[PDB]
């Protein structure tokens, strides 16, 4: 027997954030957006450069080890299945004349991945957004691969 609770149950959560039988933990927040500046990801593996990925095209990008649902399968078994989410967010700013503006900004966020995401080789806080700036480097868990982020004029 079980007493009737007032607590939750994944039902709605499951159906609403489910895909292909592999429920995704993360949702795009309303400021999902696509950029004007065309962002490119330059992969490297111990000074060996790998072909660039053009990731200006979607608002969200899933990185992990599960090739099915992930945008980018980072094949290091030290990578959890659903690992990190690249995300464009339209974040407000102040124009130098004081008038308020917003730019599509690229932000990476980790889903409590196992072994840690390294931003310029610092492990970042999970379930939290971190902006990516020009030339910056990324490393997930202890993978032997590293990445540098640029865009067209960068």
């Amino acid at each position: 027997k079980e007493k009737p609770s007032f607590e939750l149950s994944g039902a709605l959560l499951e159906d609403t954030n489910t895909f292909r039988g592999v429920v995704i933990k993360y949702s795009e927040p309303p400021e999902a957006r696509i950029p004007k500046k065309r962002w490119r990801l330059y992969p490297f593996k111990n000074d060996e450069v790998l072909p660039v990925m053009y990731i200006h095209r979607q608002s969200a990008y899933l990185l992990g080890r599960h090739r099915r649902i992930a945008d980018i399968p980072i094949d290091h078994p030290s990578c959890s299945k659903q690992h990190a989410v690249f995300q464009y967010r339209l974040v407000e700013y102040t124009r130098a004349d004081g008038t308020v503006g917003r730019r599509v900004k690229p932000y990476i966020i980790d889903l409590g991945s196992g072994n840690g995401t390294f931003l310029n080789n610092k492990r970042i806080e999970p379930q939290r957004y971190y902006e990516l700036k020009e030339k910056d480097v990324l490393k997930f868990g202890f993978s032997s691969r590293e990445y540098v982020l640029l865009h067209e004029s960068s």
């Binding site: 490297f44 000074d47 450069v49 310029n120 480097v137």
Partner: peptide, 9 residues
């Protein structure tokens, strides 16, 4: 530029 920046990092 890419490899220069990666090395400077």
């Amino acid at each position: 530029m890419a490899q220069k920046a990666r090395e400077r990092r």
